[PDB]
Amino acid sequence: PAGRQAGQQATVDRLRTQVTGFLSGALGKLQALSAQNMDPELAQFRVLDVDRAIMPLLIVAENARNPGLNLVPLHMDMAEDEEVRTQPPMAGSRHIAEFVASARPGRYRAVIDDGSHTRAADIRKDASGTSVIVVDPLRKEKDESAYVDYADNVNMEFGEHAKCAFIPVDIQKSFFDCRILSLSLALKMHDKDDAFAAFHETLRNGGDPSHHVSRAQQTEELGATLVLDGAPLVDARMMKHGQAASSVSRYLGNHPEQSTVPVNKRNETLGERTTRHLVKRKVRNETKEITFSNSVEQKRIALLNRAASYVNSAPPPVVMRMAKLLQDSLLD
Numbered sequence: 001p002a003g004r005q006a007g008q009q010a011t012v013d014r015l016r017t018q019v020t021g022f023l024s025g026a027l028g029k030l031q032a033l034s035a036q037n038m039d040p041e042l043a044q045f046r047v048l049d050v051d052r053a054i055m056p057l058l059i060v061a062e063n064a065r066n067p068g069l070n071l072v073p074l075h076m077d078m079a080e081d082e083e084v085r086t087q088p089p090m091a092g093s094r095h096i097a098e099f100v101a102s103a104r105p106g107r108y109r110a111v112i113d114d115g116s117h118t119r120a121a122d123i124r125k126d127a128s129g130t131s132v133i134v135v136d137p138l139r140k141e142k143d144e145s146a147y148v149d150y151a152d153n154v155n156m157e158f159g160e161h162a163k164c165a166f167i168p169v170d171i172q173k174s175f176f177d178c179r180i181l182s183l184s185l186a187l188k189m190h191d192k193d194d195a196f197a198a199f200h201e202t203l204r205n206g207g208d209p210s211h212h213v214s215r216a217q218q219t220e221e222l223g224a225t226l227v228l229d230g231a232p233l234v235d236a237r238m239m240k241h242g243q244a245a246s247s248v249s250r251y252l253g254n255h256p257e258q259s260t261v262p263v264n265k266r267n268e269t270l271g272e273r274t275t276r277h278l279v280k281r282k283v284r285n286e287t288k289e290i291t292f293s294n295s296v297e298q299k300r301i302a303l304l305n306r307a308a309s310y311v312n313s314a315p316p317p318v319v320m321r322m323a324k325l326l327q328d329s330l331l332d
């Protein structure tokens with residue numbers, strides 16, 4: 001091991017210990033809460049702070065575990081407004097305009113922060129320009145006209161000549177699970193790389209989006225494609241972490257063919273897996289007892305487990321890089 005240490009075996013070892021120490025610290029706390037069926041918000045646990053700090057490290061690990069994922073943290077311009085935003089962007093996050101301008105041509109996934117909420121994205125950039133497919137894990141808008149302006153603002157961030165599709169999906173119910181959900185969606189995008197790529201071509205050629213999705217419309221101010229029904233592009237595997245049982249149930253009721261496909265290697269269907277994750281606990285409105293799927297909180301724990309294992313045996317430059325990312329979370 002000394003060969004790759006470059007003579008700082010002590011510093012590398014201590015920084016490795018420090019990173020695994022933090023991950024294991026967060027992991028332990030999250031595991032205690034989940035095992036005891038306890039709401040984090042009622043337990044005074046600050047998931048938002050922990051999610052923001054671990055997220056750059058999760059991206060490093062996921063990129064290494066899946067070569068080609070090419071996951072990049074991005075933020076919209078409003079995320080740079082310290083007066084309105086809930087949190088500053090995660091460490092290493094890049095402004096969209098800056099990314100689009102200077103990034104090497106290729107295929108990217110992204111988690112995109114607007115200052116208070118995070119979405120997932122699949123991005124294709126080449127000589128002809130940039131096309132992006134945005135999937136929002138949250139779908140809370142009463143009037144479905146608010147999504148039209150969402151599609152615009154995203155397309156505006158990438159430039160008006162960029163092709164854009166905006167797909168709001170009813171997955172998130174809590175207020176703080178957008179980051180982990182978007183990370184999961186990014187991974188699924190990589191999983192369905194060819195399906196999203198085909199959609200990119202259609203967007204770039206101005207073809208019929210109905211070859212990829214069930215219901216779509218052009219916004220007609222930027223020409224962005226708003227997708228109010230993403231199936232089959234948004235399949236059962238992307239609905240796995242649905243927090244409300246009714247969201248999963250309603251989805252299957254709307255796309256019955258998705259109810260029998262296996263969503264993991266243990267051959268569970270979406271319904272079987274969701275039912276397995278159902279819990280009943282007190283949360284905050286003072287308190288409310290509800291039934292929902294704790295699938296997301298398990299996912300966060302699984303991701304931390306991955307990240308910790310990766311750091312344990314990661315090469316020294318990676319340890320350095322992840323230690324710095326952890327430290328830089330305190331710069332804003």
Ligand SMILES: O=P(O)(O)O[C@H]1[C@@H](OP(=O)(O)O)[C@@H](OP(=O)(O)O)[C@@H](OP(=O)(O)O)[C@@H](OP(=O)(O)O)[C@H]1OP(=O)(O)O
Pocket residue numbers: 184187188191237240263264265266273299
């Ligand atoms: O690579 P994938 O086929 O996409 O599935 C992997 C994972 O793989 P490994 O355990 O072998 O490392 C699990 O897969 P299973 O063993 O259960 O089949 C898991 O799935 P479950 O949570 O349902 O158990 C999870 O998937 P998910 O986040 O959708 O729940 C995860 O997926 P990712 O690679 O996207 O992180």
